[PDB]
Write a protein that binds this ligand. Structure first.
Ligand SMILES: Cc1cc2nc3c(=O)[nH]c(=O)nc-3n(C[C@H](O)[C@H](O)[C@H](O)COP(=O)(O)O)c2cc1C
Ligand SMILES: CN(C)c1cccc(NS(=O)(=O)c2nnc(NC(=O)c3cccc(Br)c3)s2)c1
Ligand code: SF4
Length: 372
């Protein structure tokens, strides 16, 4: 009909997904994306379409060019209190709800942080239905959630081993177990939960990981398993569901939508070639998949931005130690990209980023992924 709109019906054979007390109409999460990539426009429109919109809680101090920070040094949010800004996260959630209303929303918060519990509690207070946490083994998420018993809790893992450990440790100390698990494979965007040399080993392809995680989940009552990393279209979704996943998490396709809150990607992705997608070191301590542009090119030229830890974004870096060793500050680079700086920004992508040709709307994307 040329153009399908929000008043238009659509038939799907995908089934609604229950995560804790929350139901989403389609078994699809839009993966959280920092810094400033999945905020109110992206996540609110995803949730409007009946998938899980996920607000990234990382680097919210950059929102609206540090509208909600108390102190700025060298155009950066000062310390973790301002880098993970409570007021900004509150405004981002409120603005997403103007679009999606009470439709469920997640908040994504990396475990490797100073202040993890504070940011989790902030996300709950901002109205998140679901907390999603990777980049670490999040054995204590219920510690910080106990005043918000409706919020569902979802660790991101990269092995069946981690599922077993997390369930044991949660069950023993909180008499609770996770509401779902996301298993993230090595074709994903952002940071990988694998050493570099394991990111190319067939052992660790997502289709091998999913059955193992689903099997481990059986002992604990068939906790829903969400497959993530390299899922591009409905064919890949169906493959993962047929392997026992209850749903999928997808990010790179949404990075290529109009509603993405980091507007640079709409310019950058249509030009992106596969040869310019690489795995680089990160001050977070896991490999990161990046676009060979911006600060990465400036480092090679010997023009790298100066490093001085202002935002104190992640504990493994030790206030700049690791940033200086790997050559860049991830907070500074991602914030610059959100602010539109093509020369010194840092840009991330899944392995599939080169397949983005046209920038489409979230509505059109969900229609593509769910029809039939
Ligand atoms: C640009 C970008 C930024 C990301 N940032 C985060 C992040 O901050 N936290 C996180 O848990 N995952 C992050 N991810 C991972 C995604 O949420 C998702 O799990 C993954 O990219 C899915 O693989 P796909 O991109 O091939 O669909 C990011 C991914 C991309 C592409
Ligand atoms: C150990 N372990 C389960 C583990 C390890 C690595 C990846 C995963 N998979 S993942 O949690 O989905 C993520 N992928 N990319 C991420 N990026 C960020 O957190 C981040 C993004 C932007 C700024 C900043 Br400062 C941090 S987090 C799991
Ligand atoms: S120097 Fe390290 S801890 Fe400080 S903001 Fe940059 S990457 Fe984060």
């Amino acid at each position: 009909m040329k153009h399908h709109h929000h008043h238009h019906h659509m038939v799907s054979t995908l089934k609604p997904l229950k995560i804790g007390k929350h139901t989403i109409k389609f078994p699809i999460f839009q993966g959280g994306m920092g810094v400033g990539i999945s905020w109110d426009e992206l996540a609110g429109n995803v949730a409007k379409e009946g998938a899980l919109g996920v607000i990234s809680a990382v680097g919210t101090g950059y929102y609206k060019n540090m509208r909600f920070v108390e102190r700025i040094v060298a155009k950066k949010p000062f310390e973790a209190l301002n880098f993970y800004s409570k007021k900004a996260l509150n405004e981002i959630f409120a603005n997403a709800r103007k679009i999606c209303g009470n439709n469920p929303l997640g908040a994504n918060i990396l475990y490797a942080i100073n202040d993890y519990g504070r940011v989790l509690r902030d996300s709950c207070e901002a109205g998140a239905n679901i907390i999603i946490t990777g980049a670490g083994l999040p054995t204590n998420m219920p510690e910080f959630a106990k005043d918000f018993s409706d919020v569902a809790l979802i660790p991101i893992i990269s092995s069946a081993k981690a599922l077993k450990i997390l369930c044991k440790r949660w069950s023993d100390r909180y008499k609770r177990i996770p509401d779902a698990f996301i298993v993230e494979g090595p074709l994903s965007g952002g940071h990988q939960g694998f050493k570099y040399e394991d990111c190319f080993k067939e052992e660790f392809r997502l289709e091998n990981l999913v059955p193992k995680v689903v099997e481990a989940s059986k002992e604990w009552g068939n906790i829903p398993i969400i497959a993530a990393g390299g899922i591009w279209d409905r064919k890949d979704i169906d493959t993962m569901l047929s392997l026992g996943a209850s749903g999928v998490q997808m990010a790179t396709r949404f990075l290529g939508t109009k509603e993405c809150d980091a507007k640079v990607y709409a310019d950058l992705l249509p030009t992106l070639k596969k040869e310019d997608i690489l795995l680089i070191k990160s001050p977070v301590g896991y490999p990161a998949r990046a676009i060979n542009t911006g600060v990465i090119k400036r480092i090679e030229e010997g023009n790298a931005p100066k490093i001085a830890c202002v935002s104190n974004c992640v504990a493994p870096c030790n206030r700049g130690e690791e940033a200086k060793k790997v050559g860049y500050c991830i907070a500074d680079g991602l914030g610059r990209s959100y602010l539109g700086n093509r020369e010194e920004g840092l840009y991330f992508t899944g392995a599939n980023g080169y397949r983005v040709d046209k920038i489409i709307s979230v509505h059109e994307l969900i229609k593509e992924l769910t029809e039939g």
